[PDB]
Enzyme design. Structure first.
Site, PDB file in Angstrom:
ATOM      1  N   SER A  82      12.306  30.363  27.875  1.00 23.47           N
ATOM      2  CA  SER A  82      13.064  29.753  29.183  1.00 23.47           C
ATOM      3  C   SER A  82      13.104  28.293  29.066  1.00 23.47           C
ATOM      4  CB  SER A  82      12.553  29.946  30.406  1.00 23.47           C
ATOM      5  OG  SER A  82      11.101  29.693  30.453  1.00 23.47           O
ATOM      6  N   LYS A 125       8.477  28.831  39.673  1.00 28.72           N
ATOM      7  CA  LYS A 125       9.151  27.741  39.180  1.00 28.72           C
ATOM      8  C   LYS A 125       9.903  26.921  40.290  1.00 28.72           C
ATOM      9  CE  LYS A 125      10.555  30.052  35.167  1.00 28.72           C
ATOM     10  NZ  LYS A 125      11.355  30.379  34.067  1.00 28.72           N
TER      11      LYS A 125
END
Lengths: 176, 124, 62
Positions: A82, A125
């Protein structure tokens, strides 16, 4: 939980060893790299190189320069890729010297062509982003529902920017 | 699919025991609340297949899959027009030794095919 | 407790093997270093190289 890790880049060897030089611009990566993370970093490096040729052909910085990029550790291996998207812009900034826009966060996975794939841990996140003060965030379109399943009180001030191809991000992080 | 159907049935049971609804008639319009918004919004990675990338089929352990073999120019084509150096190839994807050999074979065959069908194309 | 250690550095090979040579200035590190310490030392080495190229561009020592 989540975190906000600063992917960093530097030129660990002078750019112009030989103006005529046709040697490759090696890249060295640190951060307790795994095998999958090594491959993802290579993919991001190649995509950044090709993007620079397409957009700024005269910029031979990335093609001919020996670079060191550090991705801070802590992310679970499954979420390692990611960081790919981040890596790209990092290198690109170092190529053009333009700092990335302030208080901007991004997570995504590149596929050697620039297209961005979904990721996990969107909620954590986003929480880390909110706690870190960032007001602009970038996520893949495929994760959008996960970002919209969150409460409203957690998304105040987050000028979200959904994308599916890296080109859009270059128009966001590097506005001018 | 078993997990999803079990989830919707569990939420229907909750909506029946304590919920106002004595019976449930599940429809897509209602479905959003029984299981949430859809996950797989795209049937594929894309539907255009830009240059240098092609779809293929893989017989993985967990059934079959459609994987996109991608290609990119990781170094400018013309370092020097006189330059006669060969186009070294880089490869990723946890490639095995036999797969490395197969990739080399395919690379050479593609080079020869371009030689035959387009000699002027020294790209590859 | 704490201690006052001394980080030492030395040139373990002649500077000029080939005046034209464009090779790397490899670095060897000791001290029973762990992996994270090795990466930190590598980061410090690269930062020192960049800082020298910024401040003393003509100094190709590092």
């Amino acid at each position: 939980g989540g975190s906000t890790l600063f992917v960093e880049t530097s030129l660990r060897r002078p750019q112009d060893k030989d103006a005529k030089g046709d040697k490759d611009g090696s890249l060295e990566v640190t951060g307790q790299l795994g095998e999958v993370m090594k491959e993802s970093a290579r993919i991001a490096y190649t995509f950044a190189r090709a993007f620079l040729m397409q957009h700024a052909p005269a910029n031979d910085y990335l093609v001919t320069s020996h670079i060191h990029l550090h991705v801070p550790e802590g992310a679970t291996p499954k979420d390692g890729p990611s960081a790919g998207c981040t890596i790209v812009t990092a290198l690109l900034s170092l190529a053009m010297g333009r700092p990335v826009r302030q208080n901007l966060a991004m997570t995504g996975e590149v596929s050697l062509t620039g297209k961005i794939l979904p990721v996990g841990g969107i909620k954590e996140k986003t929480i880390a982003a909110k706690r870190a003060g960032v007001t602009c965030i970038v996520l893949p379109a495929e994760n959008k529902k996960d970002f919209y399943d969150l409460a409203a009180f957690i998304t105040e001030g987050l000028e979200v920017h959904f994308v599916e191809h890296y080109r859009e991000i270059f128009d966001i992080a590097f506005p001018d | 699919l078993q997990k999803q159907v079990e989830k919707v049935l569990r939420k229907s049971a909750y909506k029946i025991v304590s919920g106002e609804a004595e019976s449930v008639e599940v429809t897509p319009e209602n479905l959003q609340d029984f299981v949430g918004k859809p996950v797989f919004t795209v049937e594929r990675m894309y539907d255009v297949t830009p240059p240098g990338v092609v779809m293929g089929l893989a017989w993985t352990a967990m059934g079959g899959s459609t994987l996109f073999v991608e290609t990119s120019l990781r170094r400018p084509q013309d370092k020097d027009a006189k330059g006669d150096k060969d186009g070294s190839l880089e490869v990723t994807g946890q490639l095995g030794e036999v797969m490395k050999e197969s990739a080399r074979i395919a690379y050479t065959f593609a080079r020869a095919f371009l030689m035959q069908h387009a000699p002027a194309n020294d790209y590859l």
